[PDB]
From a paper:
To gain further experimental insight into the mechanism of inhibition of HDAC6 by DFMOs, 1 was cocrystallized with zHDAC6-CD2. Surprisingly, the refined electron density of the bound ligand was not compatible with the inhibitor structure and suggested that a DFMO ring opening reaction had occurred. Several reaction mechanisms were hypothesized, and the resulting substructures were aligned with the experimental electron density map. In the crystal structure, the hydrazide NH2 group is positioned to share a sp3 lone pair with the metal cation, whereas simultaneously acting as a HB donor with both catalytic key residues His573 and His574. The position of the ZBG carbonyl oxygen atom suggests a HB with Tyr745 rather than a bond with the Zn ion, indicating hydrazide monodenticity. A weak π-alkyl bond is established between triazole and Leu712, whereas the phenyl substructure of the cap interacts with His462 and Pro464. Finally, the apical 2-aminoimidazoline is bound to Asp460 through multiple HBs. When incubated with zHDAC6-CD2, 1 is converted into 2 first and 3 thereafter. Taken together, these data indicate that the complex with 1 itself and the hydrazide 3 observed in the crystal structure are unlikely to be the long-lived enzyme–inhibitor complex detected kinetically.
pmcZinc (Zn)-dependent histone deacetylases (HDACs) are a family of 11 evolutionarily related hydrolases that catalyze the removal of acyl residues from histones, non-histone proteins, and polyamines. HDAC6 stands out among the 11 human isoforms, as being the only one that has two homologous tandem catalytic domains (CD1 and CD2). Furthermore, HDAC6 is mainly localized in the cytoplasm, and its main substrates are various non-histone proteins, such as α-tubulin, Foxp3, Hsp90, β-catenin, cortactin, and peroxiredoxins. By combining kinetics, X-ray crystallography, and mass spectrometry, we found that DFMO derivatives are slow-binding substrate analogs of HDAC6 that undergo an enzyme-catalyzed ring opening reaction, forming a tight and long-lived enzyme–inhibitor complex.
Residue numbers in the entry: 442 to 798
Write the structure that this text describes.
């Protein structure tokens, strides 16, 4: 089997002009890439080139209005960049932002194409800016275009409309954009695990609760696993995979697995407040490799501790390359609040999945 890797230093050019310390730093991707070199993982991978997404590809998920507004930021003066950033929840924009967001999406399209043609078995995309909060009509939470949603649609566009795509989002935040784009769709199964805190955690919406199971023919194809009152870690994520993610995924029988792989649930993240370890991430990756005949694309989303994200994403690539999962030492017993979350999702989804009845 061959593992693809896409990384292009051009995605570093998107930057916060008036807050150089903003957590969504350029060096997130260079630090992840440098860790791959230190661990000698880069020479074991087939390098997939980045490319720009086309406007026609962006229109698979986004409105003409949204594409045109973000495109226009490439030519804006600083005052207009600052004003446009302020139209959105948690966005900064530079004149390089649009091109970086196009490269993040086209990198993922090239990776998906490599996987579906069998040029590679699996792949990792070290990309920024992130994607999962972007909606059809709006940018949000450091995201301009929904890289993972667009990749699922691009995959369907080069195979067949009904190609079965699983998106697993283990970023500590709910992928509100991904959920909304696929809410009525049974061809794309969206499974998110996220800090929820009864709706108080970003992005601050009851849309992220367990009772949002999808709409119309999409009912049962949106799986929210919300965490409340607890610093969740490896035991909680392992229990969620065992009871919910893997049984549902096997029954859906995906032909492609996209991971919205934020590492902001990692031990040491300044924003997440959780304690998933790099070995924890390796175990989750290794379980997803059992789906879709191993056709897994890992796409970087959030994660703001440069050392944590570099160790965590490298451990994931190691698993894609066939290395044995490292053992999980220091497994505390499952938090009560996590058992309740898992039970509530099981009850919400039992009507839709015979593997949960
Ligand atoms: N996947 N989604 C996310 O990861 C995700 C994570 C968070 C948010 C919302 N948001 C924004 C910031 C923020 C922090 C620090 C900051 N700047 C400085 N500089 C000096 C001191 N602090 C500027 C903004 N903190 N929470 C949205 C999406
Ligand atoms: K998530
Ligand atoms: K769906
Ligand atoms: Zn996040």
């Amino acid at each position: 089997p061959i593992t693809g890797l896409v990384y292009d230093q051009r995605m570093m050019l998107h930057h916060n002009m008036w807050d150089s310390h903003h957590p969504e730093l350029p060096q997130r991707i260079s630090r992840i890439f440098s860790r791959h070199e230190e661990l000698r993982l880069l020479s074991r991978c087939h390098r997939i080139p980045a490319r720009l997404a086309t406007e026609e590809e962006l229109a698979l998920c986004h409105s003409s209005k949204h594409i045109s507004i973000i495109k226009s930021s490439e030519h804006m003066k600083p005052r207009d960049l600052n004003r446009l950033g302020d139209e959105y929840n948690s966005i900064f924009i530079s004149n390089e932002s649009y091109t970086c967001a196009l490269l993040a999406a086209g990198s993922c399209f090239n990776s998906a194409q490599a996987i579906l043609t069998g040029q590679v078995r699996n792949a990792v995309a070290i990309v920024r800016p992130p994607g999962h909060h972007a909606e059809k009509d709006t940018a949000c939470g450091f995201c301009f275009f929904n890289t993972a949603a667009l990749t699922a649609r691009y995959a369907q566009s080069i195979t067949r409309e009904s190609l079965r795509v699983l998106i697993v989002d283990w970023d500590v935040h709910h992928g509100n954009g991904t959920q909304h784009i696929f809410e009525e769709d049974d061809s794309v199964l969206y499974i998110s695990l996220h800090r929820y805190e009864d709706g108080a955690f970003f992005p601050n919406s009851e849309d992220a609760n367990y009772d949002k199971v999808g709409l119309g023919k999409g009912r049962g194809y949106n799986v929210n696993i919300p965490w409340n009152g607890g610093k969740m870690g490896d035991p909680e994520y392992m229990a969620a995979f065992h009871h919910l993610v893997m049984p549902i995924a096997r029954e859906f029988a995906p032909e492609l697995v996209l991971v919205s792989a934020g590492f902001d649930a990692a031990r040491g993240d300044p924003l997440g407040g959780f304690q998933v370890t790099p070995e924890g991430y390796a175990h989750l990756t290794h379980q997803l490799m059992s789906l879709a005949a191993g056709r897994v694309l890992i796409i970087l989303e959030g994660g703001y501790n440069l050392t944590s994200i570099s160790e965590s994403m490298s451990m994931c690539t190691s698993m894609l390359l066939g290395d044995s999962p490292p053992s999980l030492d220091h497994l505390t017993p499952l938090k009560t609040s996590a058992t309740v979350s898992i039970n509530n999702v099981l009850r919400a989804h039992a009507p839709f999945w015979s593997s949960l009845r």
